[PDB]
Structure 1
Amino acid sequence: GQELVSLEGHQSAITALAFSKNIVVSGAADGTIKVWDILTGQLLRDHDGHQSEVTALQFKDNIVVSGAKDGTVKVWYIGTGQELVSLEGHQSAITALAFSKNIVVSGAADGTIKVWDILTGQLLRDHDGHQSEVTALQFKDNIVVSGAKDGTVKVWYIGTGQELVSLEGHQSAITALAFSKNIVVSGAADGTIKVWDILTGQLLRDHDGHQSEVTALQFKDNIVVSGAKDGTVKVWYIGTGQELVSLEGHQSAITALAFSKNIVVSGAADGTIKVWDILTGQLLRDHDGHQSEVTALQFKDNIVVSGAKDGTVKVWYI
């Protein structure tokens, strides 16, 4: 349970983080984007980003999709950092990104949602998504599910361009989403978690949650992991709302969550990173990760990658 590598990090707060293969892409509030090789810990690509704060990152098959505060959306190659396609982006700040096959879906602070083809650069769909800032976005199988700061959740089809079903949403800002072919599950800031039949729109379950002011959510299978400002990390079943295991949490506000296999990695505003086993509830690791708030966590193949508000990027083993 030590550090794999030292990484130089950035000169400003880490705002986005992506992890794939042995490559980590990190974005900072000064617009700089850096690419690192985990095996050697060397910075391969420097200054490939934007001129405003990086707000979202997507990394899939040697291609990085990055969004910035000025609304720009860039698609470039990790090998050379040269942009592949030119996207006009949004006029408002990018707030959410989804990347699947050749499609990029971007959400902005004005509520707009745009669908791009990263082979032609064409704007496939221009959407007046919500009357509020798009705070979450999930893309799967030709259908987009979005969440906004006003509590609204929406799903639509890319070709038709109209909504498939009307979901009532929440009454606080949405935090994280996920959905299957049959159901949608969404969670808001006040702890609410709701599941929706996509066809009819019916509310199959309405859970009030166990926390006040959640700051991070993570869905996988029917298990939700929720962190809150009070420092609690809770694991429970979305079908019934029953808590599964008890975790000590942190003495500081939860600011990042990662979830892989049966391992939960949580980061707090004091920089501490904790590693839990949801089968037993025991604390596997208790790292004094960073000296500032943990702003991003990536967890793949027993390797945790973390970023902090001081610009540091660390990578760990379990």
Structure 2
Amino acid sequence: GQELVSLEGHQSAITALAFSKNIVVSGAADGTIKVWDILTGQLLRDHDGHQSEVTALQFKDNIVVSGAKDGTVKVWYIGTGQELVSLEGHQSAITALAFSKNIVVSGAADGTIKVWDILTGQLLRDHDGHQSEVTALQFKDNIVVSGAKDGTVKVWYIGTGQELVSLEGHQSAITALAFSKNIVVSGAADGTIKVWDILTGQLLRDHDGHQSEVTALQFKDNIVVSGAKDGTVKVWYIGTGQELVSLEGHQSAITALAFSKNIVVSGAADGTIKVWDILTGQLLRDHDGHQSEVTALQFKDNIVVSGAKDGTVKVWYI
């Protein structure tokens, strides 16, 4: 249960992290994107990247979509780093990326949401979306669910361009959300969690949460993992709001979360990285992973990839 490989990382803070198969894609605040080999620890290449801070990364199959602070959205081949198609991108900072099938949905800090076709790069839908910075973006089955810094949550159907239903949203900035079937679940920075009906719009469940000022959220099935500034990492049920397991959490602000099967990984602002099993509540591992705030976590098949504010990228084994 140690590190699998040693990666050099970046010369500036890690701001985006993606992990697929045995390849890690990392973006830094200086615009640099690096492609790593998890099996050999060597970097595949230095991507020419963006001239601005990489803000989001999407890595699916062999195609990675990267957005930056200058509004560019690039689609390129993981094997060569070569641009596959040119997207016009947004005029404001890219703040959210979603990637499903051959469609890319990008959110911006001005509230705009654009829908691209990675086959032609043509702009499919370019709506104003929100009057606030888009903070969350989930896209599945030609349905886009977006959240914003003002607490608004919207549901669009790609192609039609209009909204399917209207949701009351939250009184606080959206931190994460998810959706499937009849249910849209969203979480705001004030700890509230709201479960919506994708066709009715009714607030089916409205919980105030068990923390004040949550920083990270994660949804897997009907279970929420919430990290807060006071260091508390909590696991509770979407249906009733009852807590499902007691974890001690960190003594520093939670800045990153990861959730896969029965294992929750949390990063804190002091660099510590703890790993629990959600069933037994037992701390599988705790480590001072980085000397700086953990800013991104990726977890696939008992492998934890972590990014930090000093630019270090590390690969852990469960």
Structure 1 length-normalised TM: 0.99
1:104-129 deviation digits (Å, cap 9, x = unpaired) = 00000000000000001110001111
1:228-262 deviation digits (Å, cap 9, x = unpaired) = 00000000000000001000000000000000010
**Distance between the aligned counterparts of 1:242 and 1:177, measured in 2?**
19
8 Å CA contact 2:224–2:238 kept in 1: the answer is yes
Gap runs ≥5 in structure 1 = none
Q: How far did 1:159 drift?
A: 1.3
Q: How far did 1:269 drift?
A: 0.3
**Distance between the aligned counterparts of 1:164 and 1:139, measured in 2?**
14
Find the counterpart in structure 1 of residue 139 from structure 2: 139
**Distance between the aligned counterparts of 1:213 and 1:219, measured in 2?**
18
Q: How far did 1:181 drift?
A: 1.7
1:148-188 deviation digits (Å, cap 9, x = unpaired) = 00000000111111111010000000000101121100000
Q: How far did 1:133 drift?
A: 0.2
8 Å CA contact 1:116–1:125 kept in 2: the answer is yes
1:259-318 deviation digits (Å, cap 9, x = unpaired) = 001000000000000001110111110111000000000000000000000000000001
SS in structure 1 opposite 2:91?
A: coil
Q: How far did 1:48 drift?
A: 2.9
8 Å CA contact 2:6–2:314 kept in 1: the answer is yes
**Distance between the aligned counterparts of 1:135 and 1:49, measured in 2?**
23
8 Å CA contact 2:35–2:47 kept in 1: the answer is no
Find the counterpart in structure 2 of residue 33 from structure 1: 33
SS in structure 2 opposite 1:5?
A: strand
8 Å CA contact 1:115–1:123 kept in 2: the answer is yes
SS in structure 2 opposite 1:168?
A: coil
8 Å CA contact 2:30–2:53 kept in 1: the answer is yes
8 Å CA contact 1:94–1:108 kept in 2: the answer is yes
Find the counterpart in structure 2 of residue 187 from structure 1: 187
**Distance between the aligned counterparts of 2:151 and 2:102, measured in 1?**
29
1:66-99 deviation digits (Å, cap 9, x = unpaired) = 0000000000001111100000000000000000
8 Å CA contact 1:104–1:117 kept in 2: the answer is yes
SS in structure 1 opposite 2:121?
A: coil
Find the counterpart in structure 2 of residue 130 from structure 1: 130
**Distance between the aligned counterparts of 1:47 and 1:116, measured in 2?**
22
**Distance between the aligned counterparts of 1:235 and 1:85, measured in 2?**
41
Cα RMSD (Å): 0.5
Q: How far did 1:47 drift?
A: 3.1
8 Å CA contact 1:45–1:78 kept in 2: the answer is no
Runs of 4+ in 1 over 4 A off after TM superposition: none
> Which residues of 2 match residues 299-310 of structure 1 at below 5 A?
299-310=299-310
**Distance between the aligned counterparts of 2:159 and 2:294, measured in 1?**
39
Find the counterpart in structure 1 of residue 225 from structure 2: 225
8 Å CA contact 1:174–1:188 kept in 2: the answer is yes
Find the counterpart in structure 2 of residue 98 from structure 1: 98
Q: How far did 1:205 drift?
A: 0.3
> Which residues of 2 match residues 6-25 of structure 1 at below 5 A?
6-25=6-25
**Distance between the aligned counterparts of 1:170 and 1:221, measured in 2?**
21
Find the counterpart in structure 1 of residue 55 from structure 2: 55
SS in structure 2 opposite 1:311?
A: coil
> Structure 1 vs Structure 2: percent identity of aligned residues?
100
Higher mean Cα deviation, 39-48 or 305-314?
A: 39-48
**Distance between the aligned counterparts of 1:48 and 1:102, measured in 2?**
23
8 Å CA contact 1:30–1:54 kept in 2: the answer is yes
**Distance between the aligned counterparts of 2:266 and 2:29, measured in 1?**
22
8 Å CA contact 2:266–2:275 kept in 1: the answer is yes
**Distance between the aligned counterparts of 1:217 and 1:116, measured in 2?**
27
1:180-234 deviation digits (Å, cap 9, x = unpaired) = 1211000000000000011110010000000000000000010000000000000
**Distance between the aligned counterparts of 1:43 and 1:57, measured in 2?**
17
Find the counterpart in structure 2 of residue 196 from structure 1: 196
8 Å CA contact 2:218–2:225 kept in 1: the answer is yes
8 Å CA contact 1:297–1:305 kept in 2: the answer is yes
8 Å CA contact 1:66–1:75 kept in 2: the answer is yes
